[PDB]
Scaffold this motif. Structure first.
Motif, PDB file in Angstrom:
ATOM      1  N   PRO A   7       0.983  -0.990  -0.081  1.00  0.00           N
ATOM      2  CA  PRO A   7       0.051  -0.165  -0.132  1.00  0.00           C
ATOM      3  C   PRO A   7       1.032   1.186   0.152  1.00  0.00           C
ATOM      4  O   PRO A   7       2.107   1.264   0.394  1.00  0.00           O
ATOM      5  CB  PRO A   7      -0.928  -0.136   1.333  1.00  0.00           C
ATOM      6  CG  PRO A   7       0.105  -0.842   2.222  1.00  0.00           C
ATOM      7  CD  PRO A   7       0.698  -1.802   1.209  1.00  0.00           C
ATOM      8  N   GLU A  90       2.288  -5.689   5.969  1.00  0.00           N
ATOM      9  CA  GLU A  90       1.337  -4.778   5.381  1.00  0.00           C
ATOM     10  C   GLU A  90       1.098  -5.141   3.857  1.00  0.00           C
ATOM     11  O   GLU A  90       2.190  -4.965   3.132  1.00  0.00           O
ATOM     12  CB  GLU A  90       1.656  -3.489   5.738  1.00  0.00           C
ATOM     13  CG  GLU A  90       0.575  -2.593   5.284  1.00  0.00           C
ATOM     14  CD  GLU A  90       1.046  -1.016   5.690  1.00  0.00           C
ATOM     15  OE1 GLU A  90       1.948  -0.569   5.164  1.00  0.00           O
ATOM     16  OE2 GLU A  90       0.248  -0.397   6.028  1.00  0.00           O
ATOM     17  N   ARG A  91      -0.137  -5.382   3.425  1.00  0.00           N
ATOM     18  CA  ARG A  91      -0.287  -5.548   2.187  1.00  0.00           C
ATOM     19  C   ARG A  91      -1.607  -4.866   1.600  1.00  0.00           C
ATOM     20  O   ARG A  91      -2.691  -4.860   2.087  1.00  0.00           O
ATOM     21  CB  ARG A  91      -0.526  -7.029   1.828  1.00  0.00           C
ATOM     22  CG  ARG A  91       0.834  -7.519   1.771  1.00  0.00           C
ATOM     23  CD  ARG A  91       1.825  -7.570   0.688  1.00  0.00           C
ATOM     24  NE  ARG A  91       3.063  -8.366   0.846  1.00  0.00           N
ATOM     25  CZ  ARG A  91       3.868  -8.142   1.988  1.00  0.00           C
ATOM     26  NH1 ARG A  91       3.673  -6.992   2.904  1.00  0.00           N
ATOM     27  NH2 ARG A  91       4.808  -8.645   2.044  1.00  0.00           N
ATOM     28  N   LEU A  92      -1.618  -4.349   0.140  1.00  0.00           N
ATOM     29  CA  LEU A  92      -2.653  -3.951  -0.282  1.00  0.00           C
ATOM     30  C   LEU A  92      -3.612  -4.831  -0.729  1.00  0.00           C
ATOM     31  O   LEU A  92      -3.213  -6.007  -0.810  1.00  0.00           O
ATOM     32  CB  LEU A  92      -2.379  -2.952  -1.561  1.00  0.00           C
ATOM     33  CG  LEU A  92      -3.288  -2.468  -2.592  1.00  0.00           C
ATOM     34  CD1 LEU A  92      -4.250  -1.520  -1.818  1.00  0.00           C
ATOM     35  CD2 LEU A  92      -2.777  -1.804  -3.757  1.00  0.00           C
ATOM     36  N   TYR A  97      -7.402  -1.307  -0.126  1.00  0.00           N
ATOM     37  CA  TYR A  97      -7.303  -1.667   1.181  1.00  0.00           C
ATOM     38  C   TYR A  97      -6.349  -2.049   1.837  1.00  0.00           C
ATOM     39  O   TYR A  97      -5.227  -2.207   0.966  1.00  0.00           O
ATOM     40  CB  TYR A  97      -8.495  -2.618   1.582  1.00  0.00           C
ATOM     41  CG  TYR A  97      -9.935  -1.928   1.668  1.00  0.00           C
ATOM     42  CD1 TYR A  97     -10.935  -2.537   0.679  1.00  0.00           C
ATOM     43  CD2 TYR A  97     -10.364  -1.013   2.463  1.00  0.00           C
ATOM     44  CE1 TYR A  97     -12.069  -1.907   0.615  1.00  0.00           C
ATOM     45  CE2 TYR A  97     -11.535  -0.469   2.325  1.00  0.00           C
ATOM     46  CZ  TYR A  97     -12.595  -1.002   1.495  1.00  0.00           C
ATOM     47  OH  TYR A  97     -13.846  -0.417   1.086  1.00  0.00           O
ATOM     48  N   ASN A  98      -5.952  -2.264   2.880  1.00  0.00           N
ATOM     49  CA  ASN A  98      -4.712  -2.652   3.684  1.00  0.00           C
ATOM     50  C   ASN A  98      -5.272  -3.956   4.299  1.00  0.00           C
ATOM     51  O   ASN A  98      -6.112  -3.969   5.187  1.00  0.00           O
ATOM     52  CB  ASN A  98      -4.271  -1.801   4.677  1.00  0.00           C
ATOM     53  CG  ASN A  98      -3.688  -0.437   4.060  1.00  0.00           C
ATOM     54  OD1 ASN A  98      -4.209   0.002   2.892  1.00  0.00           O
ATOM     55  ND2 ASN A  98      -2.974   0.547   4.729  1.00  0.00           N
ATOM     56  N   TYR A 100      -3.380  -7.326   6.920  1.00  0.00           N
ATOM     57  CA  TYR A 100      -2.072  -7.536   7.901  1.00  0.00           C
ATOM     58  C   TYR A 100      -1.720  -8.891   8.086  1.00  0.00           C
ATOM     59  O   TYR A 100      -2.895  -9.464   8.753  1.00  0.00           O
ATOM     60  CB  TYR A 100      -2.057  -6.587   9.150  1.00  0.00           C
ATOM     61  CG  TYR A 100      -2.206  -5.088   8.784  1.00  0.00           C
ATOM     62  CD1 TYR A 100      -1.011  -4.446   8.835  1.00  0.00           C
ATOM     63  CD2 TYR A 100      -3.340  -4.342   8.839  1.00  0.00           C
ATOM     64  CE1 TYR A 100      -0.962  -3.241   8.386  1.00  0.00           C
ATOM     65  CE2 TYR A 100      -3.364  -2.841   8.214  1.00  0.00           C
ATOM     66  CZ  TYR A 100      -2.131  -2.434   8.134  1.00  0.00           C
ATOM     67  OH  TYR A 100      -2.150  -1.057   7.692  1.00  0.00           O
TER      68      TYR A 100
END
Length: 140
Positions: A7, A90-92, A97-98, A100
């Motif tokens: 993100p 942490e990933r889009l 959105y994010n 975890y």
């Protein structure tokens, strides 16, 4: 194990982690308890995210200084110690959105998630495709 769509990342200042499905703010209570509240004026929903490395972050409460963490059982809790359980990938997601993922438990796909009722979903129960794993960092 996972995609690397990151993100835009917002670690400059504290933020609120707003969850889609239920519409709560990830909250880390003083007693270490983790859950969610629709109270935007709660001084325990303000979190400061910091990047450990690319794609890796920490989630600390600016109010009590606790770290969000997931235990070997998949339960989230507040930690006052920087152990290997405070690391989150942490990933889009869905392109906006994010999400975890517990770094320690990445290979099992244990995300940070909140149920519609405001309670935290234990790792094993979460998974790709649930609105519970979607978060959006809103200004404070």
């Amino acid at each position: 194990h996972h995609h690397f769509n990151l993100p835009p990342g917002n670690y400059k200042k504290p933020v609120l982690l707003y969850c889609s499905n239920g519409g709560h703010f990830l909250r880390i209570l003083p007693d270490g308890t983790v859950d969610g509240t629709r109270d935007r004026s709660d001084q325990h929903i303000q979190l400061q995210l910091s990047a450990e490395s690319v794609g890796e972050v920490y989630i600390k409460s600016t109010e009590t200084g606790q770290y969000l963490a997931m235990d070997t059982d998949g339960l989230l809790y507040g930690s006052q110690t920087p152990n290997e359980e405070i690391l989150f990938l942490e990933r889009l997601e869905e392109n906006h959105y994010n999400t975890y993922i517990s770094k320690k438990h990445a290979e099992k796909n244990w995300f940070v998630g909140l149920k519609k009722n405001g309670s935290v979903k234990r790792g094993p129960r979460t998974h790709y495709g649930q609105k519970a794993i979607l978060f959006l960092p809103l200004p404070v």
